[PDB]
Design a protein around this ligand. Structure first.
Ligand code: GSP
Ligand code: MG
Lengths: 177, 105
């Protein structure tokens, strides 16, 4: 089956846990429960290539900044996440997450992921966003952040609707074998 | 390899108590109580009171703790009772949990 280790990092509340849980259980958690750390599994095929996918959920809170890197040894592929409806989390990719990730794992493929794709064109979100003189992140914007960090790929998706979810994991694995 | 102090939880006395614990092959040993072997007007105290067989257990981490500890994991028997452990610091919970989880998978 070939073990593949995958770690998911990114800002508080960008929807890392939902991504993992919705993909692994096709059920969307309504929770909301801040994460310390957590482990998950999937056995998948890909591309004819049976795999065993270890999934590591990390904490977004900086308080757990000492914990987080404990997950990084042996990692094969990273998912750096930001919410398409939260330019703070997008900026933090270049500020914190990609530097931290590269500090520890200089060589492992990264996969930039824009989350909450379903709120991108949401009336009620663009309203509150634009009340902070802000704007949802756009496909070309995400694409450009990918370039700066030389991520193997940029992918947008919604865990709640599942648009593009399978695809995030199916190129996370392809980035490995 | 994996070794260190853990709190252990007594279902009967409803208290947590400190034990030096360690792992070898796939057996976890816990010592006697450290505070109580140290109050002892005697010296007694065993490093190995007893031994759990990790092969017959699964590790489970409590999402939000248990019994007024924040960082607790549980050895839930596959066959025996649960053994409930706890650390002071989350970085211990992590290390401990993974050792055993790698052993139980
Ligand atoms: N509309 C929509 N909401 C989402 C989506 N993914 C997550 N959310 C919401 O965002 C909230 C936080 O999600 P969560 O997955 O826990 O973020 P997180 O980054 O993992 O949270 P943390 O543990 O690091 S603090 C949840 O209430 C969830 O309902 C999504 O794809 N679409
Ligand atoms: Mg989380």
């Amino acid at each position: 089956s070939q073990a593949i280790k995958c770690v998911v990092v990114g800002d508080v509340a960008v929807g890392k846990t939902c991504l993992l849980i919705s993909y692994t259980t096709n059920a969307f958690p309504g929770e909301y429960i801040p994460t310390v750390f957590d482990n998950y599994s999937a056995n998948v095929m890909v591309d004819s290539k049976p795999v065993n996918l270890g999934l590591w959920d990390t904490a977004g809170q900086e308080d757990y900044d000492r914990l987080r890197p404990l997950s990084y040894p042996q990692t094969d592929v990273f998912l750096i996440c930001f919410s398409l409806v939260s330019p703070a989390s997008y900026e933090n990719v270049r500020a914190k997450w990609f530097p931290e990730v590269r500090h520890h794992c200089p060589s492992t493929p990264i996969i930039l992921v824009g989350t909450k794709l379903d709120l991108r064109d949401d009336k009620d979100t663009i309203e509150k966003l634009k009340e902070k003189k802000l704007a949802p992140i756009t496909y070309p914007q995400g694409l450009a952040l990918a370039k700066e960090i030389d991520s193997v790929k940029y992918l947008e998706c919604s865990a709640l609707t599942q648009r593009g979810l399978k695809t995030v994991f199916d190129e996370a694995i392809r980035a490995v074998l | 390899k994996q070794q260190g102090e853990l709190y252990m939880w007594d279902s009967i006395d409803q208290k947590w108590t400190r034990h030096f614990c360690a792992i070898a092959d796939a057996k976890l040993s816990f010592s006697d109580d450290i505070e109580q072997t140290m109050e002892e007007d005697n010296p007694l105290g065993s490093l190995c009171r007893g031994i759990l067989d990790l092969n017959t257990y699964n590790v489970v981490k409590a999402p939000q703790g248990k019994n007024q500890k924040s960082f607790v994991f549980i050895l839930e028997p596959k066959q025996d009772p649960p053994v409930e452990f706890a650390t002071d610091k989350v970085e211990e919970l992590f290390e401990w949990f993974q050792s055993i989880r790698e052993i139980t998978w």
